[PDB]
Design a protein around this nucleic acid. Structure first.
Lengths: 213, 140, 95, 192, 125, 141, 68
RNA sequence: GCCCGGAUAGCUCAGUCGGUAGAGCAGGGGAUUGAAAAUCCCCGUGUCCUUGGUUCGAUUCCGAGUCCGGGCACCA
RNA sequence: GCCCGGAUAGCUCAGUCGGUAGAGCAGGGGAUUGAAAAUCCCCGUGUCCUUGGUUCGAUUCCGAGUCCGGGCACC
RNA sequence: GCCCGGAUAGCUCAGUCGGUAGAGCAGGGGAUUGAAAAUCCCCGUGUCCUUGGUUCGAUUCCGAGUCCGGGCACC
RNA sequence: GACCGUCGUGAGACAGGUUA
RNA sequence: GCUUGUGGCAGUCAAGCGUUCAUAGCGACAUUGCUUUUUGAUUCUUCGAU
RNA sequence: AGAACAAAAGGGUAAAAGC
RNA sequence: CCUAAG
RNA sequence: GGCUGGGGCGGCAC
RNA sequence: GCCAGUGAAAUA
RNA sequence: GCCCAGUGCUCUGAAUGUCAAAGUGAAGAAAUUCAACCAAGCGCGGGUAAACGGCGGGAGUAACUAUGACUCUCUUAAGGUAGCCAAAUGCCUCGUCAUCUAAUUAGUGACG
RNA sequence: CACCGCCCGUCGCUUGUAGUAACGAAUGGUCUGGUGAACCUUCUGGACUGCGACAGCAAUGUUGCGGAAAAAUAAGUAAACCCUACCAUUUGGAACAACAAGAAGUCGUAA
RNA sequence: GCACGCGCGUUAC
RNA sequence: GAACCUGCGGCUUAAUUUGACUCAACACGGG
RNA sequence: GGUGGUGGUGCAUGGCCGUUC
RNA sequence: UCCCU
RNA sequence: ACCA
RNA sequence: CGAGGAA
RNA sequence: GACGAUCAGAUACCGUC
RNA sequence: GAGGUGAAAUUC
RNA sequence: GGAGGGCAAGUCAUGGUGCCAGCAGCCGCGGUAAUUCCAGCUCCAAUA
């Protein structure tokens, strides 16, 4: 709870383990948070790294599609399909628009809708996990998929999600919790007023918990 | 459950007493209940609290509702028996009970209630003072 | 009298120059109280009694202030440039 | 053997459960069990003869009641027969055991007597009699049929049929009959 | 460029035909409405014949100065005969005699149909 | 006893009482108060006069009629008099300014039921009894 | 009015009086005749309740002869 | 010139701590009626002043605008 | 002579913001009465003073005038 | 004495930016009543005060007199 | 100097009336 | 003090009144004037005495 | 060229200066 | 008074 | 304050 | 739990 | 006599809105600048005229004629009450009728 | 002529009337304060005249005495007149006003 | 006889 | 209330014959 | 001087009829 | 049934 | 007559 | 004329 | 006297003072 | 909510 | 000097008049068929 105990989630919580000495192999810590919890559309992000610094952790197939040319916008990589003859029948509704825009990351496709997005395609999907975000959709979905694959930084969109990092095993305290904060930027604060907008969260590394608030 | 307030003493053979004052005018009717010392008011229901039209502020109906309304409130005070002090603006006015009189009592008896002694306390004066109207009074 | 919010009124700044659409509001007011030299000295009377100062102020107005047109580009990045239209009463873009 | 109504409707298929209506209705009698609702009887002679009238004869009567158009039982016996066929094709019940119920329901139990004194129009609480109750019930039922039945392709044997049904149900939204049945009591419950 | 019913002349030959006996030869009969035919075929009066000739003299003797000698009559029941066209007959109505110029159109119609018998109503109060 | 006192010594009383209680009589009260002398004739039975003008007066209540009347000026008295000219043509003889002899009609006071404020009768014109002028064979000037 | 004076008399047709056939005895004679025409014993003779009116002879020539 | 309150049905006005717009009167339709009232049922219309942002949405929440209402203080 | 205020249905007076115009009384026709009143239902009414001008449109906004009103004319 | 004003039938009284003369009451003939009041239709009655002008004509629009009719009169 | 009326918050002001 | 509109006062022409006749006695319209005890303009003289 | 040229009045203005 | 009445 | 057929009350050709 | 998720808005 | 709306005066009164200095909170690094509450007073409520003073206006409106106790009205607290006059208040005014004179812009008595 | 009956007052209208009190005048009478004709009486006065004595016989004259006209006088009776109060009897007066009587005037409805 | 105002009725929605 | 019908009033008309007027006149005078 | 008269007075009247019933 | 007539 |  | 207001 | 109401009218019959 | 009336209304 | 009543006397089917002229002591007569007006006739009363 943004208090002294931050370094109790960090410093005092960095060698908890669950057995004997402390092992003999590398470490793996971070600092959990989110993306903005807005609705993955209107406003929740912009630009600027923390860091932070990371990438996947497990899988990365997100979202990118629109026309017959959006497939190759997911061929030399791996993404979801919006289909062509579906935006007039079933390419969006609940578990539909989901499918294409409901993965884990967010979305990195382009744009093309017309008079249909106030309760179907572009619509039903927003806070679900996608609704047309900033993925430099013009050359494709790879270069700006540096904001959708690796490096990172920590593009935090769709539904929660983000990253963190600072050191290895044991050598951080005030800058461990203050490294977790450092592992937060346009995700912990931003422009006009943004020093906080949530309730709680989690964190650790592999040991056991962090802040007991 | 419920947190009654009648003194800490029950018994389907232990009578509780509440003194019910009833003033029955030809305009409005009152029904009051109070300690047998009459210095601490409990229940107070008047025909006015029972209807919309000022003319009905008397009524046999208003007496029923104001009457039954009190009995319910009374079972909660844990009181079952009521002493009746019946009046009717004695002063220098028709020393005759109103209409919502025999109506009020009747309602208390029907809706359960036990009835203690019954008095008539319309204040009859020894002298008098120049009544309503004058010399000739209500004409027409 | 119907002005039109932003209209390419050439202008400059510079570090810009040429034209540039300018979002053009009219000018408002501004409090002073307890900063103004006007105050720093005009706090007096002198002082167990007073009056004011020779110009204070009951004269005879004109019944027509002036539009403090405040044109301001966004590319020129600067700087909110004032203009002066004179004729009241009126109001922004109708039209 | 038992003479069914219109040739196909057992009378003993019904019984009057409530004691009120027991003597103020016709289903119950041996003499009442008629094939045809036409008796050219001599009811309306003593001051209670009306009773002994085979409930439906009464319905037919109250039915041929609009001026010019009416005054001919001949036909009315029809409008009532078809209506019974039609009521059957919907609830397949002994349509007398329907019309009968309806009669018991559509009769207001309370009315207000207009007693005015010097301009002011006051009213009192009055309990409606049985004979009066049935009379009102039928009068009411039929009353409504014509209501819609007018400039409508819907026919009396249909309007009436549709009525006798809901009138039994107490469906306050589908029976011009029961509407008043309720209102009369309501307004009456106010004046009381 | 206007004409007349059935040829004013054919009728003068039709009426005064070979047998110009009864004022209304059975010829003219074929022309009139049932009511008129009824009357003639029934019992028409002779006076109606001497009245006839009275118009006759009025139509010729008068110079082309178009000034016909008005013939007076109460025979409002007379049905204009073809040869009766052109003359101005004064017909009684109730007060006086009415002068009417007989046009070809008023034939087969009752001579009374023109002698207004009452002055309809004007108004005010 | 009754109101009146019956004493042989109380004559005086009864006497004064009668003289007093007697004023309640109009006939008495009348002549006693020299009233007769104040009327237009000054008590007199008849009076001479000059015709001031012949005027007509309307009948009262159930009657409607033009009564013949002469306004006269009494001689020594000098008062305006209302005088009813009798019978039919009568007023046709009374010339304005002539001398007339007048007398009352049934007890000096109420005029004949018909008349309004007239209290006198005309009996002579230029000193010629009216009756005389009323019957041809008698007199005329 | 005024000019309406004696309207009646002026309008009346002056009828003349029947020039005395003979004479009317004036003196004890008249009182005598009367005595005879009425209080003479032949009239006091017939009922005093059924004797005629001293002027029923309104001058009626038809009833004048019937009596005499 | 500051400081409070409002903007809703034709009128006067309620009104979630974001999910519905509601009274009372007028107006109208009907029963009742000597007359008129009072009664007694049934209805009628709403960018909830405007413009944007918060939210899945918002009469409501916040900024700003215009207006009306309140108040309080000066005025050479 | 100067400065003010109106005028609208038959009458007394409402209203408008530039689109609409009203009420009360009167009145016309039925109803109650034996018949009139009263009362009860039904109904019709407007150069918004004349006047030019503006305006797409004027009872309404200007300019002139008529009438009926009120108010000043002091040293 | 100058400033406005009315003059119209038997008596009291109005007039398209002239061209025509009116109710009222007296009044006589009716309708009405039992008769009458009241009332409703009808009759009638005149240089619209005398002059001069304007016009095709003036009772009216003009100009003076005229009679009676409200407002102005040493120092 | 002093009454009143009438205008004026006041001071006063009336080609108003009244008196020495 | 000018000026004289306004006041007042006379005057020409003669259509009219004057019952007959324009002028005995008066005169519409139109027009020429005198007057400075009205009144109105004007501000020259006099508040550094009327 | 009697209209029109924001608005007062005047000038001006016709393949226009008006639309 | 005119965003076009520039 | 002023302009004012002399000052003034008035009016604004201030 | 969540990839499924409805509803006025999903949580360890 | 009637008017408490106006101006004044004056009462515990008003469930609520302003309202200064100190005192309090919030923000800067302070200076300082925003806040909230805050006595009176104000404004809201009441009484008050032998307190200042006030005291309307137009339409219709039969039994020749003119007429108003009649009603209609639009209307501000209230709409001049007893009483009283051409009066020391009255404009027109030398008011109109008397009266006193030969005669009255004087007197006096009337009338509104 | 029987409630569509009776009926009251304000105001108005129509036709009329001059009362009571006061005042004015007229006639008469009385009081108050004065002026005061005339006449009875009174004190005067004494033309004129009668007587006696003396101047002459006489007209006349002186004086004494007596009667006695005008004049004048005081107190008195007191006419008329005036003034100051009061009584009686008559008679007078007006616009507006007032009173009287009447009605299917007007407004309402008291009884 | 027709601008209309009443009263029996006939036919009908 | 509607259109006709028929009676009464009214207003017309040469003339619109006249009786009857709250039930106790008006399709009533056999209209 | 009559006849005749759907000409006038139903308040001059018979007769008759309506109403109170 | 006596409210209305 | 009103009540239904 | 679409079942008809005060009566 | 001041007010409500009732009435076509009510400074009257009721009602608040 | 009283009060008050046939109903209500100023009144508390 | 009267003839409806009081108050004696016309029950004339009389003429004129039409609430007009007039009568009438008091009741009341009179508004087209007046027993009271005007007048004729006949009557009554007191009778130089």
């Amino acid at each position: 709870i943004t208090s002294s105990q931050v370094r109790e989630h960090v410093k005092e919580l960095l060698k908890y383990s669950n057995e004997t000495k402390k092992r003999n192999f590398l470490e793996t810590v971070e600092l959990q948070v989110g993306l903005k919890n807005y609705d993955p559309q209107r406003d929740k992000r912009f630009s600027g790294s923390l860091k932070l610094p990371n990438c996947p952790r497990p899988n990365m197939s997100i979202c990118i599609f629109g026309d017959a040319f959006d497939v190759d916008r997911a061929k030399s990589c791996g993404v979801d399909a919006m289909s062509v003859d579906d935006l007039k029948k079933l390419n969006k509704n609940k578990k539909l628009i989901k499918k294409l825009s409901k993965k884990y990351n967010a979305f990195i496709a382009s744009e093309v809708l017309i008079k249909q997005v106030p309760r179907l395609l572009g619509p039903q999907l927003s806070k679900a996990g996608k609704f047309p975000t900033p993925v430099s959709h013009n050359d494709d979905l790879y270069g700006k998929v540096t904001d959708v694959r690796s490096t990172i930084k920590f593009q935090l969109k769709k539904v929660l999600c983000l990253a963190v990092a600072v050191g290895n095993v044991e050598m951080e305290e005030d800058v461990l919790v203050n490294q977790i904060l450092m592992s937060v930027n346009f995700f912990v604060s931003l422009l006009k007023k943004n020093w906080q907008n949530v309730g709680s969260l989690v964190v650790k590394s592999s040991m056991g918990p962090a802040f007991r608030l | 459950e419920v947190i009654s307030y009648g003194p800490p003493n029950v018994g389907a053979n232990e009578n509780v007493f509440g003194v019910c004052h009833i003033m029955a005018t030809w305009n409005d009717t009152f029904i009051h209940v109070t300690d047998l010392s009459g210095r601490e008011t409990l229940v107070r229901v008047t025909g006015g609290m029972k209807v919309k039209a000022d003319r009905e502020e008397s009524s046999p109906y208003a007496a029923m509702q104001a009457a039954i309304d009190v009995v319910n409130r009374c079972k909660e005070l844990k009181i079952n028996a009521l002493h009746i002090k019946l009046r009717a603006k004695g002063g220098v006015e028709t020393k005759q009970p109103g209409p919502g009189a025999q109506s009020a009592l009747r309602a208390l008896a029907r809706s359960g209630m036990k009835i203690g002694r019954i008095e008539d306390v319309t204040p009859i004066p020894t002298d008098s003072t120049r009544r309503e109207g004058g010399r000739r009074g209500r004409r027409l | 009298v119907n002005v039109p919010k932003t209209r390419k009124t050439y202008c400059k700044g510079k570090t810009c120059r040429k034209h540039t659409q300018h979002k053009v509001t009219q000018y408002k007011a501004g409090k002073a109280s307890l900063f103004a030299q006007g105050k720093r000295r005009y706090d007096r009377k002198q002082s167990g009694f007073g009056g004011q100062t020779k110009p204070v102020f009951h004269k005879k107005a004109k019944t027509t202030k002036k539009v403090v047109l405040r044109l301001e580009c966004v590319k020129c990045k600067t700087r909110a440039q004032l203009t002066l239209k004179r004729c009241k009463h009126f109001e922004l873009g109708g039209e | 053997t038992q003479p069914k109504l219109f040739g196909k409707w057992n009378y003993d298929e019904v019984k009057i459960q409530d004691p009120c209506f027991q003597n103020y209705i016709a289903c119950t009698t041996t003499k009442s069990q008629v094939f045809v609702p036409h008796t050219a009887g001599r009811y309306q002679v003593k001051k209670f003869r009306k009773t002994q009238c085979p409930i439906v004869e009464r319905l037919i009567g109250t039915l041929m009641f609009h001026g010019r158009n009416a005054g001919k039982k001949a036909l009315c016996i029809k409008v009532v027969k078809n209506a019974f066929e039609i009521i059957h094709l919907v609830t397949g019940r002994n349509p007398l055991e329907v019309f009968v119920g309806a009669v018991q329901n559509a009769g207001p139990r309370e009315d207000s007597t207009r007693i005015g004194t010097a301009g002011v129009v006051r009213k009192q609480a009055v309990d409606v009699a049985p004979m009066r109750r049935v009379n009102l019930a039928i009068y009411f039922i039929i009353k409504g049929c014509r209501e819609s039945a007018f400039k409508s392709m819907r026919s009396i044997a249909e309007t009436l049929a549709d009525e006798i049904i809901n009138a039994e149900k107490n469906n306050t939204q589908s029976s011009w009959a029961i509407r008043k049945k309720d209102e009369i009591e309501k307004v009456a419950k106010g004046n009381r | 460029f206007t004409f007349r019913g059935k040829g004013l002349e054919e009728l003068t030959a039709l009426a005064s035909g070979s047998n110009s006996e009864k004022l209304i030869s059975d010829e003219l009969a074929a022309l009139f409405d049932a009511k008129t035919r009824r009357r003639v075929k029934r019992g028409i009066s002779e006076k109606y014949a001497k009245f006839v000739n009275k118009v006759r003299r009025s139509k010729e003797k008068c110079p082309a100065g178009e000034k016909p000698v008005p013939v007076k009559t109460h025979y409002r029941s007379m049905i204009v005969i073809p040869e009766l066209v052109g003359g101005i007959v004064g017909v009684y109505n109730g007060k006086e005699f009415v002068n009417v110029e007989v046009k070809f159109d008023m034939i087969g119609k009752y001579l009374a149909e023109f002698a207004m018998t009452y002055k309809p109503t004007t108004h005010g109060k | 006893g009754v109101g009146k006192p019956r004493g042989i010594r109380a004559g005086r009383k009864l006497a004064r009482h009668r003289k007093d209680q007697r004023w309640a009589d109009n006939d008495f009260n009348k002549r006693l108060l020299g009233s007769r002398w104040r009327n237009p004739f000054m008590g007199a039975s008849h009076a001479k006069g000059l015709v001031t003008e012949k005027i007509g007066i309307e009948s009262k209540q159930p009657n409607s009629a033009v009564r013949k009347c002469v306004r006269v000026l009494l001689r020594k008295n000098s008062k305006k008099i209302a005088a009813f000219v009798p019978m039919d043509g009568c007023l046709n003889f009374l010339a304005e300014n002539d001398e007339v002899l007048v007398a009352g009609l049934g007890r000096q006071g109420h005029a004949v039921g018909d008349i309004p404020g007239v209290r006198f009768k005309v009996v002579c014109v230029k000193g010629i009894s009216l009756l005389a002028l009323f019957k041809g064979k008698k007199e005329k000037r | 009015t005024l000019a309406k004076a004696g309207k009646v008399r002026k309008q009346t047709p002056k009828v003349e009086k029947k020039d005395k056939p003979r004479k009317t005895p004036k003196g004890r004679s008249y009182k005598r005749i009367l005595y005879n025409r009425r209080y003479a014993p032949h009239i006091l003779a017939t009922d005093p309740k059924k004797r005629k009116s001293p002027n029923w002879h309104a001058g009626k020539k038809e009833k004048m002869d019937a009596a005499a």
